[PDB]
């Protein structure tokens, strides 16, 4: 009679204490989703920074990244489970403007289509995207060589002009800079149109040699949370 | 390939279907017969209600 009630009350108290202890950790950790073209950028960035979960802590802040495990699925009904993640890390091979995977146009139209699907997804109307343009060096090598022309695969490159407000690398050819900004500007054109200030896209020209990508991810996460807090109030 | 699909369709085709009137009558009869035992359909008194 009363013994069962007392035992259940004690069990509930112990479980509630354990749940509060678990909350103290869950609320202080950030979940990121590593989603992108599975043929490029997963191995390099994961090493630099069914499912693969890696936890990295920077500046005494606990992050937790999940790799989708490369499940071959044209339709992503498991993406609705990631509607509460802090950010979505998108990795695109900026050097694949000419490769063709039944093959897509360049794998870059495929990357743009994937980014548009993720951006316009109903369950991800708030999640911001951190975008990485991996294999920057190979893109520069391709642009320097005249074997492959960007304007052939990308018709809009002929009419494209480099932005006046830009921060080129200290040592970079103008053609490589134009190509890099073109590849960046396609993704930003996709991102800015659909968004309404809830979520933003953070481009980055990363390279395999660079090892500071963890700091970039940390800064982008900080900006994401700060902008979310600012937009929560009438500010910004 | 398509051989398995066509074989499966052939196996599924050889089946017997009763008239929709009979199935509707069966469902209606089941619903009417077991209507008394449903607590959600007819709310139980607060004395018999465990949660309330």
């Amino acid at each position: 009679q009363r013994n069962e009630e007392k035992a259940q009350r004690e069990a509930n108290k112990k479980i509630e204490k354990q749940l509060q202890k678990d909350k103290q950790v869950y609320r202080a950790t950030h979940r990121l989703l590593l989603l992108g073209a599975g043929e490029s950028g997963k191995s390099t960035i994961v090493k630099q920074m069914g499912i693969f979960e890696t936890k990295f802590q920077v500046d005494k802040v606990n992050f937790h990244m999940f790799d989708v495990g490369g499940q071959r699925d044209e339709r992503r009904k498991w993406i609705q489970c990631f509607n509460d993640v802090t950010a979505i890390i998108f990795v695109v091979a900026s050097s694949s403007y000419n490769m063709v995977i039944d093959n897509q146009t360049n794998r870059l139209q495929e990357a743009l289509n994937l980014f548009k699907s993720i951006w316009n997804n109903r369950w991800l109307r708030t999640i911001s995207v951190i975008l990485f343009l991996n294999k920057q060096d190979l893109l520069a090598e391709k642009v320097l060589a005249g074997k492959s022309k960007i304007e052939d695969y990308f018709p809009e490159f002929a009419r494209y002009t480099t932005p006046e407000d830009a921060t080129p690398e200290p040592g970079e050819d103008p053609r490589v800079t134009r190509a890099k900004y073109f590849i960046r500007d396609e993704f930003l054109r996709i991102s800015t149109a659909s968004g309404d200030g809830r979520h933003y896209c953070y481009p980055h020209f990363t390279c395999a040699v660079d090892t500071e990508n963890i700091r970039r991810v940390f800064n982008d996460c900080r900006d994401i949370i700060q902008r979310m807090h600012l937009r929560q109030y009438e500010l910004l | 390939q398509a051989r398995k699909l066509v074989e499966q369709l052939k196996m599924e085709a050889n089946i017997d279907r009763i008239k929709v009137s009979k199935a509707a009558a069966d469902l209606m009869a089941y619903c009417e017969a077991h209507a008394k035992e449903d607590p959600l359909l007819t709310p139980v008194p607060a004395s018999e209600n465990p949660f309330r």
Partner: protein
């Protein structure tokens, strides 16, 4: 008696608006579990302070000003004054606490989820109300506030008249505890938050300047600060002055500025409950 009737109607409208807004926001917080948030606990504390103000000191003060005499006892005069000081101090310090919470939210986003928790919000609210009571009930009820000039002691002796006469030291200390320190803290934290908003806007303009993709921040900060500042600043400056200088401030101006400060309780829910969730809750309730 046309002027008296008009004043009574105005004060009745003021108290009705204060009570209605406060009860609406309190019941919106209480009814829906989605609205229960660490910031919303501070909002609830401020709403409770404003509700106590509107229920206790606005109607009794209106009756006193219309009757021109205090019908109730001297103990009730002291209790009403103590409740008034409590409400003002608690409301202003809760506004300061909300400002500090927002400063910590924007300034330290990673540490915000650990620096502020549901358990510690109760501790903060209890500390705010304890400070308000210590600066309100302790001097007023133990009779430390009273002055010593002939008019003050004559008013104290007669139970018919209930008016505020206070020492220079207590007036200065109460003003610093209630308004000036929270004013400075709120100004600092809001300047920092505005700087953060400007920096974020500059970063956005850097990332997506070519595409169309700080007027809003200025408007929100002005609504939050100016309404609080314009309501309470004149009252507290004249509160300091009239004990600094004996004949500088007349009684009518003092009461007018005090009631202008009172109106801030009614104005608070409009400022602090414009979120879409609060709007949806209010629409559902009414």
């Amino acid at each position: 008696e046309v002027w008296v009737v008009g004043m009574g109607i105005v004060m009745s409208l003021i108290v009705l608006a204060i009570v209605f807004g406060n009860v609406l926001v309190i019941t919106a917080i209480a009814k829906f579990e989605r609205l229960q948030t660490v910031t919303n606990y501070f909002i609830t504390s401020l709403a409770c302070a404003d509700l106590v103000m509107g229920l206790a000191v606005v109607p009794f003060g209106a009756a006193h000003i219309l009757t021109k005499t205090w019908t109730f006892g001297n103990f009730w005069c002291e209790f009403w004054t103590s409740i008034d000081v409590l409400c003002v101090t608690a409301s202003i310090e809760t506004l300061c606490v909300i400002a500090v919470d927002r400063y910590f939210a924007i300034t330290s986003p990673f540490k915000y989820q650990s620096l502020l928790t549901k358990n510690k919000a109760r501790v903060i609210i209890l500390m705010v109300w304890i400070v308000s009571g210590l600066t309100s009930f302790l001097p007023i009820q133990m009779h430390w506030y009273r002055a010593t000039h002939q008019e003050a002691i004559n008013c104290y002796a007669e139970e018919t008249c209930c008016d505020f006469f206070t020492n220079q030291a207590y007036a200065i200390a109460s003003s610093i505890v209630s308004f000036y320190v929270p004013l400075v803290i709120m100004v600092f934290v809001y300047s920092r938050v505005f700087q953060e908003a400007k920096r974020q806007l500059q970063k956005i303009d850097k990332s997506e300047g070519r595409f169309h993709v700080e007027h809003k921040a200025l408007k929100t900060l002005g609504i939050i600060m100016g309404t609080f500042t314009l309501c309470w600043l004149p009252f507290f400056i004249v509160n300091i002055v009239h004990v600094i200088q004996d004949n500088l401030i007349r009684k009518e101006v003092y009461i007018l500025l005090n009631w202008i400060g009172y109106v801030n309780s009614g104005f608070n829910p409009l400022i602090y409950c414009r979120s879409p969730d609060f709007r949806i809750a209010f629409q559902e309730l009414l």
